[PDB]
């Protein structure tokens with residue numbers, strides 16, 4: 001969902017599964 005991501009480039013990477021690494025719980 002990359003919705004919880006409160007970043008720009010991070011959330012704007014179209015890679016939730018990839019972003020989840022640096023944006024997990």
Ligand SMILES: [Zn+2]
Pocket residue numbers: 005006007010011019020022023
């Ligand atoms: Zn993120």
